[PDB]
Structure formats: structure tokens, C-alpha cells
Amino acid sequence: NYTTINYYKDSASNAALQLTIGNSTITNSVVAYGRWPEFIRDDDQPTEPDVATCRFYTLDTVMWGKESKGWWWKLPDALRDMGLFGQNMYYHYLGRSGYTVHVQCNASKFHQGALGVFAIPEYCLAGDSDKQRYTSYANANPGEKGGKFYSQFNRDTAVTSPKREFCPVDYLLGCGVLLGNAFVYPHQIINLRTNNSATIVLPYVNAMAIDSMVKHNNWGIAILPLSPLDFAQESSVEIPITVTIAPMCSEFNGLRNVTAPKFQ
Amino acid sequence: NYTTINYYKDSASNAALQLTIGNSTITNSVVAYGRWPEFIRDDDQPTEPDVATCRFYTLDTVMWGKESKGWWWKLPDALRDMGLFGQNMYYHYLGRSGYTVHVQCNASKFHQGALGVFAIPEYCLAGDSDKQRYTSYANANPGEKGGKFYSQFNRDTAVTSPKREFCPVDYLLGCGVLLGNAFVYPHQIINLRTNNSATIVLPYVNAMAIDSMVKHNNWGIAILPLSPLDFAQESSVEIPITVTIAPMCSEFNGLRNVTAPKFQ
Amino acid sequence: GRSGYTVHVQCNASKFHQGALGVFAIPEYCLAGDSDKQRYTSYANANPGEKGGKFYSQFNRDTAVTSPKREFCPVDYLLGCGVLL
Amino acid sequence: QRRSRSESTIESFFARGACVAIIEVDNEEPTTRAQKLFAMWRITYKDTVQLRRKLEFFTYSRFDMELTFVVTANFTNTNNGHALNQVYQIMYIPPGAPTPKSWDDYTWQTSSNPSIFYTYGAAPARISVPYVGLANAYSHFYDGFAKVPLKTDANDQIGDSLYSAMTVDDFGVLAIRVVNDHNPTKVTSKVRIYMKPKHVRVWCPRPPRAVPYYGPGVDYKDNLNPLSEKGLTTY
Amino acid sequence: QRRSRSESTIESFFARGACVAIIEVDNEEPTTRAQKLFAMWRITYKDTVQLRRKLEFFTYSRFDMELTFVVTANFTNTNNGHALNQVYQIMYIPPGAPTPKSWDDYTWQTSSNPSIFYTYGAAPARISVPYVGLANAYSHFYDGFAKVPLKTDANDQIGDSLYSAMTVDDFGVLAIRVVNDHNPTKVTSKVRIYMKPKHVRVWCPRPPRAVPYYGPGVDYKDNLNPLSEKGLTTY
Amino acid sequence: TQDSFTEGGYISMFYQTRIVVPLSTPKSMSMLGFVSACNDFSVRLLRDTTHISQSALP
Ligand SMILES: Cc1cc(CCCOc2c(C)cc(-c3noc(C(F)(F)F)n3)cc2C)on1
Ligand SMILES: Cc1cc(CCCOc2c(C)cc(-c3noc(C(F)(F)F)n3)cc2C)on1
Ligand SMILES: N[C@@H](CCC(=O)N[C@@H](CS)C(=O)NCC(=O)O)C(=O)O
């Protein structure tokens, strides 16, 4: 074989069913990257509410019709005002947690339509102005209500009082990539002719073992209608969509006074 | 592992309580660098007065008030006129010795103040003129009396008859460095509410095993008030400070006629 | 709910001061009212919270039927419950 | 035998040098008006689009770096004389270190900052850098801010920060100068920097960019119609 | 794993080249008036401030040295012709050895003194030096004199000496010349010397300099207010 | 260097009780502060400092 000896001392120089959680119960699931949520490994005492925070919280129901273009949420932003989980978030400097997301949508055998649910790590969205990275904290953290997609890019032509809001586009996924490839991310498809619910399990993903839960969002959830809703020969159709999220294996550290962000 | 062979023959080319001493007795201590004074190792017969020179000598008492800015002494300069130690100094060409320094200052429970005592190797002070390194031997070796610090730099604007004297500054330690870092040197703190005395043990420190004691000073002692003196609601307060120094493990060599420096 | 407690009382003075404080922990500490009506104290007045309450050297009856205060009237030497201190 | 996937590995996928910086430096007589006697470049991989697009296939990465420098010089006028061979100095300034204000200030002593002296006409310069990430991996995408506005803040500018940015200064800068004095004739030079990742690990694959980049972020402005026309039943 | 202190060692702290000398040498027709045909530089590390400040963290030191030389040349006029590649001679003159009085005197025979001949356009010159201290370690600070005045001295100048100085001549000097004869056109050149300590040992740590240096000693003249303003109860 | 993404926190001091002195005693006093590192401290990526400068060569 060919001979090789490394000269320098540095390595760089070298040549190259029912699910019950806590006091909540909901009656196949998808695990992101095949990794179940877990606590920090062996390699300041953390606080861990075993059941006061690891349970299912239900968000506000939304309506799906013939003109809906999609919805998106950010985690852990969406759960900032849910029981003691939010209190622990705002009373500590460092936090960590995984999630279990459950999407519910029921219809009849005479309806038709398909929804795509995508879980995206580090889901960064585009703005609505010539200025770059000018979106504000308040607009980037809607909370429980979340946001919506659009079919076109509407530039905010107002220099007097810029809105500083996102302008996602459905077929660009709001980030400049084609929607067809979004299936690279963890995903589920709800087809009304086969099923009525979707489930995803998300572990903690980040470049650090633990990070602030207030200034950084680890996950994004996007729901988009792949096929339009229809029902018999009716002009208008509307059905509800519900989202339920459960924290799992949550840890907090850095206890001090409480944080009170200015949301408008 | 990486392979390496040295080619050149030269290494440089290679890639990279009561303490009693002699007939003196004084009724925790600090050892500089954790090294006790010792005689020269195995690696002209030296002369060594075991007890005629290794004993405590007391200097002149000074007064501490509300405007005092500090005091400094040089060793072995301060002991040049102390018994047979000075005679041995001036009758020999080479000398060596360590020291034990004891600072005494007593007050009442209703006084307050703090003193910092610092032992500095190769304590070089700044001048008082535009000319550089122009200080004279007589002014640089005050002797028992020692010198004092100042709160500002007073330039000697007199070319007719320059004084050629030091101009130390308290917050610059007289050498261009911040006083707060002087604790890098061996040090003691005398706080009137806890103690009334300080003790330091200094070994012999120099680039040579033995050196002349007349043209080179090995140690400097600096005393500075870290907190101002106060007493009840009195306008003026003065208390005495005393210094006692004991040579330890002293050796001399190079006997010839006596040296008589011209001190003014 | 259930819990135990650790209570720490701090009070510092000089060598030239003098005085003595007694701290007592009482289970089921029930206090007396300030009116002829019996057990008429209100929830709000019986749960002051962090501020707490104070004792008195005498019993001051609340002679107001129009708008009764419904407050405790503890007495120092009776411990506020009818027993000697 | 059977076909192998040797060349589709991450290491093979990133085993090429890519340009990230073109920097202009001039040697001439100093004057009152603005000049390019020394240049300062902020380190980043987003100036170009090829290596950026290749890297953005993944969310997290961890690698060492190999940097190569190619220098090309030329004249500007033809009635001033000639020049002797020049020497170029390249200094790395990490965050917090003092920055030059002139081509001959004390900062060029480089007592602690690493520096390269390159002689024109020799082989292109080359150095290697280890992984210097504060966290356990580099983050190509960061959904968050560096400050959080608070209700008790005096004004709204205390907590304002750019979206999807970690630090104002990251990885420092590079300062390039010509050590030689000025000849009577002006001489221009360009330094091209080529970067090669080594010992690469990646996490969280991501769909590639489909529309032209617009700034350091994910914003898009123009040319949002990439796909072309074709018949449904046309081969 | 756990974090290491590999890069905070003394050897790593001093493992960089630092400039200590910039020397000008000219090649032109000799004339009656003063010229720079050959230059002599006194060896020291106090000309600059970065390496000096790094070294003054300690009272005593012991190390070997690595020296590197970078040469850059240029023209001055444009109506005299051109020149061929030049050769530079660098000679080390220890104390007591004869010193040149002209660019072509016998002293350049360098029968015993070491010398380096450098050809312009080649790689920067480099050499290594061992520890050459008379004592057991180098003394960055010396509180004393070299002479002691005596009562029997005829005058006061017999025993006068500079404070905090050991020897008038220490470590010798370096003499640099251009071996080639003079072309019809003048050519200027600068030699930059970079120094790297190796095999370093230190003793008696010392607080660093806080105010600008003023001369070889510890004297201070101006800018004695380094710290800035801040609020006592301001974060 | 100063950076919000790597801020460390805040240090504050308050009176738990007040300072009490008897008569014939000073009512004002001074306090000093010191800082140091522990055995679990490390640094990385040597660079030049901004605390020393130069304008002319000797
Ligand atoms: C992700 C990612 C990684 C990077 C670049 C990290 C490396 O940054 C550098 C570079 C480009 C050069 C040097 C460098 N070291 O030395 C020199 C010099 F000697 F050439 F000046 N340059 C040091 C770092 C940390 O940027 N984004
Ligand atoms: C402390 C301290 C250490 C020093 C410098 C000591 C080394 O001095 C030299 C230098 C800088 C160069 C040479 C030298 N030897 O050879 C050459 C030449 F060949 F390049 F000429 N230069 C020799 C000594 C002793 O200065 N202060
Ligand atoms: N600009 C002045 C100062 C030049 C100079 O020598 N500067 C010193 C510091 S004051 C230096 O080290 N410059 C960087 C270098 O040229 O290596 C001049 O050209 O005369």
C-alpha cells in the first residue's frame, strides 16, 4: 500500500390505540430520526417537573376551507402560556424538552382532501420588505394563534411605519425551497379517505445540550393542504383542525427572577 | 503518531506566637513562593556569622495619619548600618541573604483602617524628569529612613540643578502598573479590626547564586493604606508603624579593604 | 397539599441594647373576633398573607352594626385565644 | 464487482477548494484622499453561492478548514517607471483585538496574532484551521434572536436585534497589506481566497435553495418562478 | 472529555514571531554627504511594545531564539534606468569586535563573525540562537547600578552610571549592507526582523504595564489615566 | 468581547439588615473587592490585546 507519515503535531494539519401522558389520554406514530426524547447524559441542579409539565395541552381550533393556504407554529413558543411549563420557562435561564404532536381532523366518507404536516428544525422564515432580517420579536413569536401562509409575495411598501412581519409563500415553504422536497423533514399525511389524525414524536435537537427557551425556538410545525377540500357538489365547506402538544423529558436550570417579554 | 527526526547537532536548532532568632525574640506568617531561606548548595571560603548578623534589627518608627500615601524601603540597603551585617557587607565583594520582615501597628477597637504590605523582587521605580534612568545612587538608596509615595506626578522642571529623585505614584505603584494587581507579589493585609501585625519570610531571589550587596538591591518593601485611617469623629488621627527585619542564612565572600560609598 | 417548614427569625442589635423576644409555633392557631357575634370573622381578614397582623393590649369591641369590620382582636397577655401567655 | 458509493461520501462531496473572497490592495504614494493601501475582510462563506448552497443541504455541521491564497498583480499606468517584487502581509484579527487604522501602525507587529508573509511569484499560500466553534457544532440556521425586549425597558431599542443572527462579530477579520514602500508607479493586486472543508460531519438534512439568495438570511426578493413549462402528456 | 489548558502554556504563549526591528538600507552612488549604504542596529527587544509587554509579565526568563528576516526593495526615481537582483549581507558583531566604517572595508571578510548572504526574491532568511546569558537567567528588571561612587573619588563622574542598567554594550549589533555595486538608479530596501522565543522558562510573575512606555526603563511621562468612567450601580 | 449571544449574567449587592454602630464610633466605612478564577478555567485562540499601543519607533 501507499506510504504516509504525518509530520505536524496538529490533527487539522493532517491530510484528509390510546396514548397516556401524565393526567392526559388521547384515543401509526412517527418518531423523528428514530430517536426518542431523553434526559441529558452524565457527560447547578436542574429542575424537572415530572408530571406538572409533561402533559397534553390543546391549542385553539382552526378552520379548513376551500381557500385555506396553510398554518404554522413555533415551539416552544406556542406553549409559553400553558400551565406551569411557561412559568418554568420564564423563571429559568436554560431549558430543554422534547415534544409529542397530535393533529386531529375528522370528516365523512363523502369528503376528500389531504393535509401534510411537517416538523422542521430551525425553521427560519422570510420577511416582507427589502430590508434583510428586519422582522421583530413580537411578530416572530405569535404564540398559540400562530400564523398563515400566502399564495404570493406581498411586499410591504411603507417606509413610514414598516410592519416587520413574515411573508411566507406556500409553494416556497416560506424559506425559498420547493414544497415537494419538504418531505425530507419528518412528516405525516392525513388523507380523509384513510385516516383522521397524525402523530409525531420530536426529540431535542440543537447544537448545544441546553439553551434558552425564550430567545430561540427549536421546532416549527407546518400544516398545508396538498389537495383542496371538497364535499359533494357544495360551494362552501369548512371543517375544524385541532392540535395537541405534550412536552416530554423537560429540564430547566438557572433560577432567578421572572422574565416578562413585551408582546405588543 | 507523527514522525519527527532532528537533523542538526545543536539543541537550539530543534523545533519547539513567639519567634526567636539569635538573641532576639518577638511575640499567620507568609512564606514567599513557599521557599524557606537556605545556604548555597554543593554545586574561596565563604564567611558566615551565624548569630552576629542573623537577628532582628528595628528601623525608625513612622506615623500614619489621614493624608499619608505610603512608604517604601529597599533591602539590603536599609540594613547597611546595622551592627556587623553592614561591616560584612562593606568588607566583602559578594554577599547573599534572606530576610524575615515584621510590621507592627496597634490601635483600638474604635479605630478603622487597612494596610497593604508588599514584597517586590527587583523593585525598580520611576524618575521625576524627562531624562530617562537619570536617578542618582544617593537618592536611590535612602537607607533606614526610606521614601514616600505621592498622589500625582510632579515633574522636576529645573535644568540648572536637577534633583535626580524618584517620583512614585500611589495608584501606579511607582512603576507604571495598577496597584490592584500588586497582590500578585507576596503580600499581607493588616486590618485593624482583626489583627495588628504582619510577617513575611523572603528567600534569596536573583539570576545569580551570589551578587554584590552594594550596587544591587534584591528586595523592596512597600506599605500602602488601602483604607483611610479614622477614629470616632475626630479631625486628626496619628498612630505609629514599626518595621523589624532579621537577616537569615547570610554568606559573604571576597574579603578586601573596606568600601565607603559617598552618601551625600 | 402537604408540607413542613423551617422558620428563621433575624434581629440584630448592639451590646448596649436590651430586650427579649419570644417566638412561638402553634398548631391550629385560632384567634378571637372583635364583635358580639361569634365566629363571624371573614376569610379575607383571617388570611392577611405576607403582611400578617398585630396584637393589642386591650379588647376593642367593634360597635358598628351598620358595617361590621369582621376582624380579629387579639390580646397580648391572653395570646389572642383566651389563654395566659 | 458491484458499483460503489465512494465518491458520494460527505468528505468526497466537500473535497474541493471554493473561492469565498476577492480582495483588492493597492501600492502607491499615500495621499489625503481615500486609498486601498490596506484591506480588511470579514470572514464568512456567504459572499459566494456555490459553497453556501452545498453547505446549506444540512442544518448542523462540524469540520476543520484549509485556506489557500492566490495573489495576482498588475500595473495601471505606463509613464511612471517600474517596480520591484512586493511582499504581502496577511494578519488574522480575532474579535476584541485592535484593528489597524493605517498601513504602518503598531498593530502590524503581530506579537500574538498569527500572520503570513507572502512573496510574489512563489507558490500560493496555504494554511489550516481547526474547529473553533463555541458550541458543539456550527449552526447554518438559527431561528431566534440575541436579545429579548422587556416590558420594563425604557425604550424599544434596548431589546432590538436582527432576526436569525447570533453575534455581531464572528470569527474575526483578515487584514491584508503590502509591506513594501511605494514605487513611483502605482501597482494593483488581487488576493483570492479558496476554502476547503476537511473532516466533515453533518446533521439534519435540508432541502436545497431553489431561488436566488438575497442577503445573509433566507429572504427572497426576485425570480420566484424557477420551473419551466411542459406538457402533461408530452414525453 | 474535559477542557484542557494546552494553549495557555508558556511555550504556546510565546510561540509566535514578533517584529522587533525595521532597518533601511540604500544602494546608490557613494558621495561626500551622509548615506545609508550600510546600517548598524543594536540588538534589543524594547524597540517595540507587544513582545516587550508579553515578556515583562515575569521578572526572570531563560530561552533560545529564532530569528527571521524579510526584505522588501523598491525604486525611488524613474529616469535613471533599471537594476539587477541584489544580494544582502548581514553580519553579527559581538562586543569588542571591530565595527565597519564603510560599506567595503576589511571588516566584511567575516573570518570569525557569522554572516548571512541573502538573495532578493528567495524565501525569508532564518537562523536560530541558543541561550547566551552570562548569568543563569535573563534579567528583565535590575534594581541597581554598575558603579558605586566613593568618598575618595577625585570627581563625581567617576562613579556615575545609569540606573537599572547592567552593561553599556549587550548582545552586540547587526550590520547590514548591499554587496552589489551601485546601479545608475537608486534602490531602497527595508529589512524586517521577527523574533520567536523557544524553550522558555520564567520566574517571578509581575503585573503588566498599564501606561505607555517611556524609554528602556520603567519611567512614565504622559497618559496616566487609563481607566474610563462607569456607574457604581450601573450594569 | 461584548456580545448578547454569550452574556454571562449580573452581580448585585443589597442590605439584608443595616449597619449598626455604637456611640463614639465612625458611622462610615469602606469595603474592598477581589476576583479570581478557579481550577476549572480555560482559554482558547490566542490573540493580541488592545491595552498597549505605539505611535513611533525609537
Ligand atoms: C461555519 C463557518 C466556519 C467559518 C470559518 C472559521 C475559520 O475562521 C478562520 C479563518 C478563515 C482564518 C483564520 C486564520 N488563522 O490564521 C490566519 C492567517 F495566518 F492567515 F492570518 N487566518 C482563523 C479562523 C478562525 O466560517 N463559517
Ligand atoms: C533577553 C534578550 C535576549 C536577547 C537577544 C539574544 C540573542 O542575540 C543575538 C541575536 C539577536 C543574533 C545573533 C546572530 N548570530 O548570527 C547572526 C547572523 F548570522 F545573522 F548574523 N545573528 C546572535 C545573538 C547573540 O536580547 N534580550
Ligand atoms: N507610519 C510611520 C510609522 C511606521 C512604523 O514603523 N510603524 C511601527 C509602529 S510605530 C510598526 O511596527 N509598523 C508596522 C510595520 O511596518 O511592521 C512611518 O511610516 O514612519
Side-chain angles (χ1 to χ4, degrees):
Chain A
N1 80 130
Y2 75 101
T3 296
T4 182
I5 53 176
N6 290 332
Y7 312 102
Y8 306 90
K9 181 178 178 182
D10 302 74
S11 301
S13 301
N14 300 12
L17 187 58
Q18 61 182 4
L19 174 54
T20 298
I21 308 185
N23 54 342
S24 305
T25 294
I26 62 101
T27 294
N28 186 24
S29 302
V30 167
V31 186
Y33 305 118
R35 286 281 292 274
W36 202 267
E38 56 183 357
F39 293 100
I40 284 174
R41 323 299 293 107
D42 59 332
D43 190 327
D44 305 326
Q45 173 53 29
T47 62
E48 301 178 1
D50 182 71
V51 64
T53 59
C54 298
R55 57 182 306 281
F56 278 100
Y57 308 91
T58 296
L59 312 181
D60 296 329
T61 298
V62 296
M63 290 297 162
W64 178 18
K66 283 173 161 290
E67 290 72 9
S68 300
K69 304 299 175 189
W71 309 263
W72 59 266
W73 294 269
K74 297 293 191 65
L75 290 173
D77 176 60
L79 302 177
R80 65 168 187 247
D81 299 331
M82 287 294 185
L84 290 167
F85 184 79
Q87 301 297 342
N88 281 268
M89 285 174 57
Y90 289 137
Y91 267 103
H92 294 89
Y93 166 54
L94 303 175
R96 168 189 171 105
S97 180
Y99 307 94
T100 295
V101 181
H102 185 59
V103 181
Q104 305 93 290
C105 180
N106 56 272
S108 65
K109 298 182 183 300
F110 294 79
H111 290 73
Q112 62 179 30
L115 290 173
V117 185
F118 300 101
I120 305 172
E122 300 292 354
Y123 192 16
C124 299
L125 299 174
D128 71 332
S129 61
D130 295 330
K131 286 203 67 164
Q132 302 166 353
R133 308 188 295 183
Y134 197 55
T135 309
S136 64
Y137 179 90
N139 299 122
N141 288 275
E144 186 182 6
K145 55 173 174 292
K148 295 190 173 61
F149 286 93
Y150 307 97
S151 295
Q152 64 292 332
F153 181 72
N154 319 275
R155 188 175 71 98
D156 176 68
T157 307
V159 298
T160 301
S161 61
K163 297 191 181 71
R164 308 179 62 182
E165 294 178 0
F166 289 138
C167 179
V169 179
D170 55 359
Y171 72 100
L172 296 178
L173 197 60
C175 58
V177 308
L178 294 175
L179 178 66
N181 297 323
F183 294 82
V184 171
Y185 300 118
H187 70 93
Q188 271 284 38
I189 298 179
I190 299 177
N191 195 5
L192 298 177
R193 87 189 303 268
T194 56
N195 59 82
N196 57 16
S197 60
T199 309
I200 306 181
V201 178
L202 309 175
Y204 187 74
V205 175
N206 190 16
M208 291 160 288
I210 196 170
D211 192 359
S212 180
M213 280 189 161
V214 182
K215 57 171 62 175
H216 180 238
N217 285 320
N218 294 282
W219 285 99
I221 309 301
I223 301 174
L224 298 105
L226 303 174
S227 303
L229 184 69
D230 194 334
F231 173 53
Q233 290 71 28
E234 304 296 348
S235 58
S236 176
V237 192
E238 306 295 342
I239 55 177
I241 299 172
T242 306
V243 185
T244 312
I245 311 187
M248 306 178 65
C249 300
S250 58
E251 314 182 20
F252 302 91
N253 191 18
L255 183 75
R256 71 285 185 277
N257 52 325
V258 75
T259 295
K262 179 163 183 281
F263 290 109
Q264 187 62 49
Chain B
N1 80 130
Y2 75 101
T3 296
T4 182
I5 53 176
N6 290 332
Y7 312 102
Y8 306 90
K9 181 178 178 182
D10 302 74
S11 301
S13 301
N14 300 12
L17 187 58
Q18 61 182 4
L19 174 54
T20 298
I21 308 185
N23 54 342
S24 305
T25 294
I26 62 101
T27 294
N28 186 24
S29 302
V30 167
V31 186
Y33 305 118
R35 286 281 292 274
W36 202 267
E38 56 183 357
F39 293 100
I40 284 174
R41 323 299 293 107
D42 59 332
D43 190 327
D44 305 326
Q45 173 53 29
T47 62
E48 301 178 1
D50 182 71
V51 64
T53 59
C54 298
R55 57 182 306 281
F56 278 100
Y57 308 91
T58 296
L59 312 181
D60 296 329
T61 298
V62 296
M63 290 297 162
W64 178 18
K66 283 173 161 290
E67 290 72 9
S68 300
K69 304 299 175 189
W71 309 263
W72 59 266
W73 294 269
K74 297 293 191 65
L75 290 173
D77 176 60
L79 302 177
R80 65 168 187 247
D81 299 330
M82 287 294 185
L84 290 167
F85 184 79
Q87 301 297 342
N88 281 268
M89 285 174 57
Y90 289 137
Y91 267 103
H92 294 89
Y93 166 54
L94 303 175
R96 168 189 171 105
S97 180
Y99 307 94
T100 295
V101 181
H102 185 59
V103 181
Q104 305 93 290
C105 180
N106 56 272
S108 65
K109 298 182 183 300
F110 294 79
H111 290 73
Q112 62 179 30
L115 290 173
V117 185
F118 300 101
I120 305 172
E122 300 292 354
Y123 192 16
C124 299
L125 299 174
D128 71 332
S129 61
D130 295 330
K131 286 203 67 164
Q132 302 166 353
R133 308 188 295 183
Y134 197 55
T135 309
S136 64
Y137 179 90
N139 299 122
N141 288 275
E144 186 182 6
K145 55 173 174 292
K148 295 190 173 61
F149 286 93
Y150 307 97
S151 295
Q152 64 292 332
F153 181 72
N154 319 275
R155 188 175 71 98
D156 176 68
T157 307
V159 298
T160 301
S161 61
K163 297 191 181 71
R164 308 179 62 182
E165 294 178 0
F166 289 138
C167 179
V169 179
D170 55 359
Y171 72 100
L172 296 178
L173 197 60
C175 58
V177 308
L178 294 175
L179 178 66
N181 297 323
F183 294 82
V184 171
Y185 300 118
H187 70 93
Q188 271 284 38
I189 298 179
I190 299 177
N191 195 5
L192 298 177
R193 87 189 303 268
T194 56
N195 59 82
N196 57 16
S197 60
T199 309
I200 306 181
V201 178
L202 309 175
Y204 187 74
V205 175
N206 190 16
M208 291 160 288
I210 196 170
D211 192 359
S212 180
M213 280 189 161
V214 182
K215 57 171 62 175
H216 180 238
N217 285 320
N218 294 282
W219 285 99
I221 309 301
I223 301 174
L224 298 105
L226 303 174
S227 303
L229 184 69
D230 194 334
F231 173 53
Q233 290 71 28
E234 304 296 348
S235 58
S236 176
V237 192
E238 306 295 342
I239 55 177
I241 299 172
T242 306
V243 185
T244 312
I245 311 187
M248 306 178 65
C249 300
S250 58
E251 314 181 20
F252 302 91
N253 191 18
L255 183 75
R256 71 285 185 277
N257 52 324
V258 75
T259 295
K262 179 163 183 281
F263 290 109
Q264 187 62 49
Chain C
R2 168 189 171 105
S3 180
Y5 307 94
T6 295
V7 181
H8 185 59
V9 181
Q10 305 93 290
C11 180
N12 56 272
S14 65
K15 298 182 183 300
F16 294 79
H17 290 73
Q18 62 179 30
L21 290 173
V23 185
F24 300 101
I26 305 172
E28 300 292 354
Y29 192 16
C30 299
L31 299 174
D34 71 332
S35 61
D36 295 330
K37 286 203 67 164
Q38 302 166 353
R39 308 188 295 183
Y40 197 55
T41 309
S42 64
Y43 179 90
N45 299 122
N47 288 275
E50 186 182 6
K51 55 173 174 292
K54 295 190 173 61
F55 286 93
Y56 307 97
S57 295
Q58 64 292 332
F59 181 72
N60 319 275
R61 188 175 71 98
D62 176 68
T63 307
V65 298
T66 301
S67 61
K69 297 191 181 71
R70 308 179 62 182
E71 294 178 0
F72 289 138
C73 179
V75 179
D76 55 359
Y77 72 100
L78 296 178
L79 197 60
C81 58
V83 308
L84 294 175
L85 178 66
Chain D
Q1 53 74 266
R2 58 178 296 170
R3 295 177 271 92
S4 183
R5 293 176 172 183
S6 57
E7 196 173 1
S8 60
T9 60
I10 307 302
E11 196 69 5
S12 301
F13 188 71
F14 289 109
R16 300 290 155 86
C19 187
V20 291
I22 310 175
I23 301 162
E24 302 180 5
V25 63
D26 300 358
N27 193 20
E28 56 177 359
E29 181 179 357
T31 59
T32 184
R33 65 195 190 94
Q35 283 174 321
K36 291 164 168 284
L37 301 185
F38 75 101
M40 288 206 286
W41 173 69
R42 177 156 293 279
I43 301 178
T44 185
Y45 65 89
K46 297 176 182 295
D47 288 0
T48 60
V49 298
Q50 296 184 338
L51 181 61
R52 182 183 180 179
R53 191 171 186 270
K54 291 218 296 177
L55 285 170
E56 288 186 352
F57 268 87
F58 309 89
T59 314
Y60 303 110
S61 60
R62 183 189 174 93
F63 56 79
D64 297 327
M65 190 161 294
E66 191 188 43
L67 294 180
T68 314
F69 306 83
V70 179
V71 188
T72 52
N74 65 277
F75 288 109
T76 69
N77 198 14
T78 179
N79 54 23
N80 301 93
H82 293 64
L84 300 171
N85 211 33
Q86 299 186 145
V87 173
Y88 298 82
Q89 185 181 353
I90 304 169
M91 188 168 60
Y92 167 53
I93 304 176
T99 58
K101 295 195 287 289
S102 60
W103 79 274
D104 55 357
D105 67 317
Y106 73 100
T107 308
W108 299 103
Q109 292 176 7
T110 180
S111 178
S112 303
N113 293 340
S115 300
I116 305 176
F117 289 86
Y118 169 82
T119 303
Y120 191 84
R126 172 173 280 177
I127 59 101
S128 297
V129 183
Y131 171 76
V132 295
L134 292 171
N136 303 96
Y138 292 137
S139 303
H140 308 159
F141 300 83
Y142 176 80
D143 183 9
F145 298 81
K147 301 191 219 173
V148 177
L150 303 177
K151 284 166 140 58
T152 56
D153 290 355
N155 61 84
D156 300 1
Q157 293 70 16
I158 301 294
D160 193 335
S161 61
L162 297 181
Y163 171 71
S164 64
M166 286 182 176
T167 64
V168 181
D169 189 335
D170 52 352
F171 307 133
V173 304
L174 292 184
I176 308 183
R177 67 157 186 176
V178 178
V179 182
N180 304 37
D181 296 1
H182 69 85
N183 295 278
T185 184
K186 176 184 185 185
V187 180
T188 52
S189 302
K190 293 220 206 302
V191 183
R192 282 172 167 83
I193 302 175
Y194 293 84
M195 182 190 298
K196 194 183 77 171
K198 293 157 67 195
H199 313 134
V200 185
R201 298 179 61 182
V202 291
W203 296 269
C204 291
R206 176 175 300 257
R209 185 79 176 188
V211 297
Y213 287 109
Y214 182 68
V218 308
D219 305 328
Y220 39 69
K221 180 179 168 58
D222 296 328
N223 291 330
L224 309 181
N225 294 326
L227 305 195
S228 60
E229 183 178 3
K230 192 65 174 185
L232 181 59
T233 54
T234 303
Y235 292 100
Chain E
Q1 53 74 266
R2 58 178 296 170
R3 295 178 271 92
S4 183
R5 293 176 172 183
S6 57
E7 196 173 1
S8 60
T9 60
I10 307 302
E11 196 69 5
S12 301
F13 188 71
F14 289 109
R16 300 290 155 86
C19 187
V20 291
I22 310 175
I23 301 162
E24 302 180 5
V25 63
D26 300 358
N27 193 20
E28 56 177 359
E29 181 179 357
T31 59
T32 184
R33 65 195 190 94
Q35 283 175 321
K36 291 164 168 284
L37 301 185
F38 75 101
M40 288 206 286
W41 173 69
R42 177 156 293 279
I43 301 178
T44 185
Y45 65 89
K46 297 176 182 295
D47 288 0
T48 60
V49 298
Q50 296 184 338
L51 181 61
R52 182 183 180 179
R53 191 171 186 270
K54 291 218 296 177
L55 285 170
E56 288 185 352
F57 268 87
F58 309 89
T59 314
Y60 303 110
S61 60
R62 183 189 174 93
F63 56 79
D64 297 327
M65 190 162 294
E66 191 188 43
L67 294 180
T68 314
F69 306 83
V70 179
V71 188
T72 52
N74 65 277
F75 288 109
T76 69
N77 198 14
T78 179
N79 54 23
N80 301 93
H82 293 64
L84 300 171
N85 211 33
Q86 299 186 145
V87 173
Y88 298 82
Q89 185 181 353
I90 304 169
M91 188 168 60
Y92 167 53
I93 304 176
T99 58
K101 295 195 287 289
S102 60
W103 79 274
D104 55 357
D105 67 317
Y106 73 100
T107 308
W108 299 103
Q109 292 176 7
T110 180
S111 178
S112 303
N113 293 340
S115 300
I116 305 176
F117 289 86
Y118 169 82
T119 303
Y120 191 84
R126 172 173 280 177
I127 59 101
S128 297
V129 183
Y131 171 76
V132 295
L134 292 171
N136 303 96
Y138 292 137
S139 303
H140 308 159
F141 300 83
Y142 176 80
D143 183 9
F145 298 81
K147 301 191 219 173
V148 177
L150 303 177
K151 284 166 140 58
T152 56
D153 290 355
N155 61 84
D156 300 1
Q157 293 70 16
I158 301 294
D160 193 335
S161 61
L162 297 181
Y163 171 72
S164 64
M166 286 182 176
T167 65
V168 181
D169 189 335
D170 52 352
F171 307 133
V173 304
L174 292 184
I176 308 183
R177 67 157 186 176
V178 178
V179 182
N180 304 37
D181 296 1
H182 69 85
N183 295 278
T185 184
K186 176 184 185 185
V187 180
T188 52
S189 302
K190 293 220 206 302
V191 183
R192 282 172 167 83
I193 302 175
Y194 293 84
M195 182 189 298
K196 194 183 77 171
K198 293 157 67 195
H199 313 134
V200 185
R201 298 179 61 182
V202 291
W203 296 269
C204 291
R206 176 175 300 257
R209 185 79 176 188
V211 297
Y213 287 109
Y214 182 68
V218 308
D219 305 328
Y220 39 69
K221 180 179 168 58
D222 296 328
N223 291 330
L224 309 181
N225 294 326
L227 305 195
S228 60
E229 183 178 3
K230 192 65 174 185
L232 181 59
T233 54
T234 304
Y235 292 100
Chain F
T1 57
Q2 193 180 21
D3 192 329
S4 300
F5 189 74
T6 54
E7 53 184 359
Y10 308 97
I11 301 285
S12 59
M13 184 182 293
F14 290 89
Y15 282 116
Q16 190 75 334
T17 60
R18 75 177 183 85
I19 285 168
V20 184
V21 301
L23 301 185
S24 301
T25 312
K27 298 189 178 63
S28 299
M29 55 221 68
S30 294
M31 186 185 63
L32 304 175
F34 304 79
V35 66
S36 63
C38 299
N39 57 84
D40 65 333
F41 207 91
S42 181
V43 291
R44 230 167 48 164
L45 191 32
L46 184 76
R47 54 103 170 174
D48 283 318
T49 189
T50 61
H51 295 167
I52 193 71
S53 63
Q54 186 174 10
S55 301
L57 275 183

